[PDB]
Amino acid sequence: MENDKGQLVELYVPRKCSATNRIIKAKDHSSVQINIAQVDEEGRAIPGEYVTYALSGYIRARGEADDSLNRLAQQDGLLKNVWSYSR
Amino acid sequence: TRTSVLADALNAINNAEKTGKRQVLIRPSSKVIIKFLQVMQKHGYIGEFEYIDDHRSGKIVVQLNGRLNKCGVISPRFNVKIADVEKWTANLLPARQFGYVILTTSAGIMDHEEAHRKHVSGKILGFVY
Amino acid sequence: STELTVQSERAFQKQPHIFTNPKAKANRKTKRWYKNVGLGFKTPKTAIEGSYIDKKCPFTGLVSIRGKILTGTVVSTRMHRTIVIRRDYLHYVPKYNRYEKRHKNVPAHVSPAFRVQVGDIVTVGQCRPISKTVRFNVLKVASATGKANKQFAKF
Amino acid sequence: PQAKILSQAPTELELQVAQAFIDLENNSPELKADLRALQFKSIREIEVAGGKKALAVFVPVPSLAAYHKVQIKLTRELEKKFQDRHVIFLAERRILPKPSRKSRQTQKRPRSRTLTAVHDKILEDLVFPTEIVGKRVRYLVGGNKIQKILLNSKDVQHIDNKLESFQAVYNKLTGKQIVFEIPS
Amino acid sequence: GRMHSKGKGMSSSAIPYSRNAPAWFKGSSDGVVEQIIKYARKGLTPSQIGVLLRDAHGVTQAKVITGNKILRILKSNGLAPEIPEDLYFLIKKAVSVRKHLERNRKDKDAKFRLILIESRIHRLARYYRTVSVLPPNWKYESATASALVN
Amino acid sequence: VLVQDLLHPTAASEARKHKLKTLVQSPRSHFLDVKCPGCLNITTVFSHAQTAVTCESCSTVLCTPTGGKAKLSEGTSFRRK
RNA sequence: UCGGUUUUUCAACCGGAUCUUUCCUUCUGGCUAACCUGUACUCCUUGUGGGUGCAGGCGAAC
Ligand SMILES: [Mg+2]
Ligand SMILES: [Mg+2]
Ligand SMILES: [Zn+2]
Numbered sequence: 001m002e003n004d005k006g007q008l009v010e011l012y013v014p015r016k017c018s019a020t021n022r023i024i025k026a027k028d029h030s031s032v033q034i035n036i037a038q039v040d041e042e043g044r045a046i047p048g049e050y051v052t053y054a055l056s057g058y059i060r061a062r063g064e065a066d067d068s069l070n071r072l073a074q075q076d077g078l079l080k081n082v083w084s085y086s087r
Numbered sequence: 088t089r090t091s092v093l094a095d096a097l098n099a100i101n102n103a104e105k106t107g108k109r110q111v112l113i114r115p116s117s118k119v120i121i122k123f124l125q126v127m128q129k130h131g132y133i134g135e136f137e138y139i140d141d142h143r144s145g146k147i148v149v150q151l152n153g154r155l156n157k158c159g160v161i162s163p164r165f166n167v168k169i170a171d172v173e174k175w176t177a178n179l180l181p182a183r184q185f186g187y188v189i190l191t192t193s194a195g196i197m198d199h200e201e202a203h204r205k206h207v208s209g210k211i212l213g214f215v216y
Numbered sequence: 217s218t219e220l221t222v223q224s225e226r227a228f229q230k231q232p233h234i235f236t237n238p239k240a241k242a243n244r245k246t247k248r249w250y251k252n253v254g255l256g257f258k259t260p261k262t263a264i265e266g267s268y269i270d271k272k273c274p275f276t277g278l279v280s281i282r283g284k285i286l287t288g289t290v291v292s293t294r295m296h297r298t299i300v301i302r303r304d305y306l307h308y309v310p311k312y313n314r315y316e317k318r319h320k321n322v323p324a325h326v327s328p329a330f331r332v333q334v335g336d337i338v339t340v341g342q343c344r345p346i347s348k349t350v351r352f353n354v355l356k357v358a359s360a361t362g363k364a365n366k367q368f369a370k371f
Numbered sequence: 372p373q374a375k376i377l378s379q380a381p382t383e384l385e386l387q388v389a390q391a392f393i394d395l396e397n398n399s400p401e402l403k404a405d406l407r408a409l410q411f412k413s414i415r416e417i418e419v420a421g422g423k424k425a426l427a428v429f430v431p432v433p434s435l436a437a438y439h440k441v442q443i444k445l446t447r448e449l450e451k452k453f454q455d456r457h458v459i460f461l462a463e464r465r466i467l468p469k470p471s472r473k474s475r476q477t478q479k480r481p482r483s484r485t486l487t488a489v490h491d492k493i494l495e496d497l498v499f500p501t502e503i504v505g506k507r508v509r510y511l512v513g514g515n516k517i518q519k520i521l522l523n524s525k526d527v528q529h530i531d532n533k534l535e536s537f538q539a540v541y542n543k544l545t546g547k548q549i550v551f552e553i554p555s
Numbered sequence: 556g557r558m559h560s561k562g563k564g565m566s567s568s569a570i571p572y573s574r575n576a577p578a579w580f581k582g583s584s585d586g587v588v589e590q591i592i593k594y595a596r597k598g599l600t601p602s603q604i605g606v607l608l609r610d611a612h613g614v615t616q617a618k619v620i621t622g623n624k625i626l627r628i629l630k631s632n633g634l635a636p637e638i639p640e641d642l643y644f645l646i647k648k649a650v651s652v653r654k655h656l657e658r659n660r661k662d663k664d665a666k667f668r669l670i671l672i673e674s675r676i677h678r679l680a681r682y683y684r685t686v687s688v689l690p691p692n693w694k695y696e697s698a699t700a701s702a703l704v705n
Numbered sequence: 706v707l708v709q710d711l712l713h714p715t716a717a718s719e720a721r722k723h724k725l726k727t728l729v730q731s732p733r734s735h736f737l738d739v740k741c742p743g744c745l746n747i748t749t750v751f752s753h754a755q756t757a758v759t760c761e762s763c764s765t766v767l768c769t770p771t772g773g774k775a776k777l778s779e780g781t782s783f784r785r786k
Numbered sequence: 787u788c789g790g791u792u793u794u795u796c797a798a799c800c801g802g803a804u805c806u807u808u809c810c811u812u813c814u815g816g817c818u819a820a821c822c823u824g825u826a827c828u829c830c831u832u833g834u835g836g837g838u839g840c841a842g843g844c845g846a847a848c
Contacts, residue, residue, distance in 0.1 A: 020107045021153030059107060064707045071708055086710045109708045128512060140506035141729055142572055148711050165313055204799065363687065371633055466807050475811050502575060505729060569730040579786050610756045613749040
């Protein structure tokens with residue numbers, strides 16, 4: 001990771017799934033990045049500006065990916081009461 | 088028979104983590120268990136945990152951030168003799184940089200580093216990384 | 217132990233070199249010699265006031281308590297004036313990092329100054345060899361009454 | 372007669388309280404005979420945020436049942452008289468420390484005299500007309516315990532705006548952080 | 556998960572949170588105590604008494620209202636039996652089985668069951684001796700058992 | 706699934722769950738004020754009887770025992786305590 | 787400062803004394819170190835900077 005002379009070693013720092021906090025590996029051909037665009041007035045959807053969510057393959061495989069995504073959305077306010085904390 | 092409660096708790100936590108859950112429901116709850124949890128919290132392996140009062144044994148709800156990759160009790164609480172801690176560390180922990188061996192000393196329940204600092208040893212409990 | 221009579225066998229049993237001058241009559245009539253064993257232990261009133269004899273008593277006899285002082289639970293009272301003490305301990309087997317439960321019976325001498333039942337915990341002091349197996353002499357009996365105060369359940 | 376309903380009587384607040392109690396005897400049948408067999412083991416006033424100052428009125432323990440039977444009306448009266456302030460009837464309880472492995476065995480410590488039990492009792496006393504349902508204990512990431520006490524959907528109107536005050540009192544007493552809640 | 560069968564059930568009473576007397580219940584603890592004493596005099600076991608209290612009267616649990624468990628109360632008054640209730644019941648059961656066996660001999664299942672019962676009794680006896688509720692020498696046999704029962 | 710508030714769940718869900726298996730154990734049974742059609746007396750009958758509970762003054766039998774919840778004697782009228 | 791060495795701004799870390807409803811085994815005495823003192827009040831910058839000094843008495847200093 002960190003060398004004694006301050007400077008970084010570590011060839012690349014990996015992405016962690018925004019739902020589990022678990023690391024996504026390099027040959028994780030199942031994992032995903034969802035880009036949800038920043039909206040404006042009159043809708044219009046601001047070009048080249050978005051909220052990104054990484055999902056590990058594992059969650060997707062399991063099935064509780066959609067739910068996780070929903071949860072993520074309803075903490076950045078992209079959805080308004082779809083997911084409830086108390087189930 | 089529920090021979091060990093702490094062990095059960097730890098196993099439950101592990102199960103929760105592996106399946107990706109963000110919260111556990113530990114069911115018998117003790118002093119020792121609480122202490123163990125606190126150590127983890129201090130080291131940042133766990134979020135906020137809370138103790139429900141049943142008026143009988145207890146029940147703990149634990150929030151998991153996702154950083155904790157294994158708990159684990161080492162069961163027959165072996166009497167570890169200061170110079171012996173190192174061997175245990177070598178065995179149980181995945182590296183020499185991080186991870187903690189939790190051991191109950193007369194100075195209280197702590198991780199091995201803390202014990203070393205304080206210069207105390209006792210019976211082993213578990214490990215976290 | 218003794219159990220009654222005192223002057224009960226073929227020879228007259230007296231404390232050696234203790235003289236009770238049968239001319240000028242004393243209060244006790246017969247003089248009783250005793251000593252405190254030391255080590256913080258107390259000579260019981262049963263020993264001072266009693267009429268029993270014993271050479272092998274640590275209070276009223278000739279033996280001296282020195283060396284090791286052990287403790288353990290009483291297993292057998294059956295043989296006269298002596299006792300058997302069980303002494304449970306843990307033997308550490310290093311290969312398996314664990315402990316064996318172990319045993320060792322210590323035969324010990326019981327001064328008639330004591331009431332000893334099977335199961336009482338007893339403090340025993342080392343002395344001069346007394347018989348083939350006995351090296352130890354009972355100093356303190358810890359189980360005093362058990363539940364001799366309130367034995368019956370009725371309030 | 373003031374100094375006779377006090378166990379031992381120094382201070383001025385205590386005297387005032389006694390006087391108030393005496394005055395309250397002029398309600399007659401509901402607030403006499405039952406009020407006549409009552410005393411204090413001193414009174415401590417605790418500063419609460421906002422300007423209010425709560426009144427921890429310490430009480431023997433065999434007397435407590437009687438107090439409970441009487442309490443609410445009496446408390447209200449006190450409040451009316453001693454304006455702005457809240458009056459809390461806590462029982463004076465012993466607490467005996469843990470017999471340290473070195474110390475002398477002073478005969479078995481009763482489990483009512485254990486600290487936790489005492490604390491629980493105090494808590495019970497504090498919210499009197501409202502019973503306690505669930506208890507939660509939040510252990511925070513920072514490293515400090517916050518207790519969470521759940522109460523009935525009934526009785527609440529007796530307890531109203533006193534909750535902060537109660538919390539403050541608790542803090543003063545033990546040094547533990549409390550949060551009160553009403554689930555429905 | 557059960558002590559002599561393969562059974563794994565979890566059926567049990569679930570005691571409520573509040574130790575305090577229920578808000579709707581009036582009466583008095585003294586009254587309850589008196590009632591309990593009366594019941595004892597009449598000739599009932601603790602459990603039965605408790606059941607009665609639960610049903611005919613407003614008593615949820617005796618410890619909730621009085622401050623004490625029923626057995627304790629009985630003891631205090633001097634009414635708790637020579638043999639603890641459960642043990643007595645077990646003994647009675649055993650005796651019945653024995654009687655049955657005496658009558659018909661080829662009942663092997665019954666015999667097997669009897670053994671289990673005996674074992675249970677022994678366990679209970681051991682427990683009691685340790686706690687010193689029974690006199691520390693009390694043993695269970697056949698004729699003696701019958702006598703105890705009757 | 707994955708993320709839940711385990712501490713305060715939905716009431717309906719709790720109700721659905723078995724007694725004991727709830728967050729804190731609590732009885733599903735309750736007590737009843739039983740009015741017998743004849744005399745003006747109120748008896749407090751537990752909903753899961755076992756015993757054939759009669760009025761304290763007159764023998765009438767208010768409840769008969771069943772597997773779980775006890776059955777009331779038709780002429781009787783109850784009110785939940 | 788003559789590659790080493792002293793404090794402060796600061797830290798985490800390991801202790802110690804306490805006070806919190808808290809005794810830490812308790813006295814029968816030896817030494818009571820000390821001032822809780824105040825007996826004459828002042829060697830003295832306008833002072834509570836400082837100490838020759840002994841009847842009541844803190845004992846942890848053994
Ligand atoms: Mg089971
Ligand atoms: Mg078995
Ligand atoms: Zn009728």
